[PDB]
Amino acid sequence: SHMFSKFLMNVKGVTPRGSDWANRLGPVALFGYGAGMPRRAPLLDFFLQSPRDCDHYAELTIHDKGPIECPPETVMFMPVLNCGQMLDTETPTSDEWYLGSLEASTELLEKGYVPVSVGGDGSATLSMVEAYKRLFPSDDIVIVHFDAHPDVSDPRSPLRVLLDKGLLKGVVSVGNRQVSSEDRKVRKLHKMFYMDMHAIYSKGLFCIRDIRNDYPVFISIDADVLDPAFAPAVDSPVAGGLSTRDLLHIMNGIRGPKVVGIDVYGYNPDLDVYRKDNVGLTAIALSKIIKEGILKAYSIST
Amino acid sequence: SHMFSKFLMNVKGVTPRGSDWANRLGPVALFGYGAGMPRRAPLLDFFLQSPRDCDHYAELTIHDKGPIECPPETVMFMPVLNCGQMLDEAAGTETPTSDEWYLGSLEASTELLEKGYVPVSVGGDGSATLSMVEAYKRLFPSDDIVIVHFDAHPDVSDPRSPLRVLLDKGLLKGVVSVGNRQVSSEDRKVRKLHKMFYMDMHAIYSKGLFCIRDIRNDYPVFISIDADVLDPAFAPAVDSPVAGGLSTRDLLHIMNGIRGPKVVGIDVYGYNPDLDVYRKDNVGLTAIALSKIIKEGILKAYSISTHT
Amino acid sequence: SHMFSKFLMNVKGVTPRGSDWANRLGPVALFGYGAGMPRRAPLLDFFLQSPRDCDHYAELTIHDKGPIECPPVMFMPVLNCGQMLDEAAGTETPTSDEWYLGSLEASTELLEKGYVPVSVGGDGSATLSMVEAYKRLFPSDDIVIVHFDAHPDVSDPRSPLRVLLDKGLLKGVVSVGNRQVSSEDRKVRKLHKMFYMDMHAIYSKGLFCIRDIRNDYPVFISIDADVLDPAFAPAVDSPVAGGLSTRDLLHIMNGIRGPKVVGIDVYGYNPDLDVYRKDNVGLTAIALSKIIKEGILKAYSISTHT
Ligand SMILES: [Mn+2]
Ligand SMILES: [Mn+2]
Ligand SMILES: [Mn+2]
Backbone angles phi, psi at B91, to 5 degrees: -115, 15
Q: How far is the CA of C176 from the centre of ligand 3 (A)?
A: 11
Q: How far apart are CA A242 and CA A224, in angstroms?
A: 9
B147 by Cβ neighbours in 10 Å (0-12 / 13-18 / 19+) ranks as buried
Q: Which residue of C has its CA nearest to B179?
A: C55
Largest Cα span, chain C:
52
Sheet with A259-265: strands ordered across: A59-63, A77-85, A28-32, A114-118, A259-265, A217-222, A142-146, A170-174, A193-195
Q: Which ligand is nearest to the CA of B226?
A: 2
Helix (H, G, I), strand (E, B) or coil at A5: helix
Expressed in angstroms and rounded, the spacing between residue B300 Cα and the centre of ligand 2 is 22
Fold for domain C1-306? Arginase; Chain A (3.40.800)
In the PDB record, what is the listed experimental method?
X-ray
Q: Kindly give the distance from the C-alpha atom of residue B297 to the centroid of ligand 2, in angstroms, as a whole number.
A: 18
Pairing of strands B146-150, A193-195: unpaired
Kindly identify which residue of chain B lies nearest to residue C292, measuring between CA atoms: B243
- Name the residue among B40, B153, B144, B139 with its Cα closest to residue B89: B40
- 8-state DSSP, C33: -
Dist. CA B228 → ligand 2 center (Å): 5
Rounded to 5 degrees, what angle do the CA atoms C253, C254, C260 make?
Answer: 85
The answer to whether B236 and B210 have CB atoms below 8 angstroms apart is no
Per the CB < 8 A criterion, the answer to whether B306 and B217 are in contact is yes
User: Chain A contacts of C200, Cβ < 8 Å?
Assistant: 55-56, 248-249, 252
Using a CB-CB distance cutoff of 8 angstroms, which residues of chain A are in contact with residue C227?
none
DSSP state of B84: E
Nearest to B265 by CA among B130, B162, B171, B66: B130
Look at C274 and A275 and tell me if their CB atoms are within 8 Å. yes
A88 CB-near residues (< 8 Å, 6+ apart): A3, A5, A6, A7
- Asked whether A30 and A264 are in contact (CB, 8 A), the reply is no
Classify B32 as helix, strand or coil. strand
A203 touches chain B (CB under 8 A): yes
Output the 3-class SS for C200-235.
HHHHHHCHHHCCCECCCCCEEEEEEHHHECCCCCCC
| Domain A1-302 indexed as CATH 3.40.800.10 | yes
- Residues C38, C43, C46: CA angle, nearest 5 degrees: 140
* C224 marked ligand binding residue: yes
Contact list, B289 vs chain A (CB under 8 Å): 228-229, 239
C40 to chain A, closest Cα gap in Å: 14
8 Å CB contact between B157 and B169: no
* Residue A264: CB atoms within 10 Å: 26
Resolution in angstrom units: 2.0
Which among B231, B245, B276 has CB closest to C278? Answer: B276
- Cα angle B291-B294-B298, degrees, rounded to a multiple of 5: 145
The b/e string for C62-97 (b: 16+ C-beta within 10 A; e otherwise) is eeeebebebeeeeebbbbbbbbbbeeeeeeeebeee
Kindly state the helix (H) or strand (E) to which residue A62 belongs, with its residue range: strand A59-63
- CATH code: domain B1-308 is 3.40.800.10
Q: How far is A285 from chain C (nearest CA, A)?
A: 5
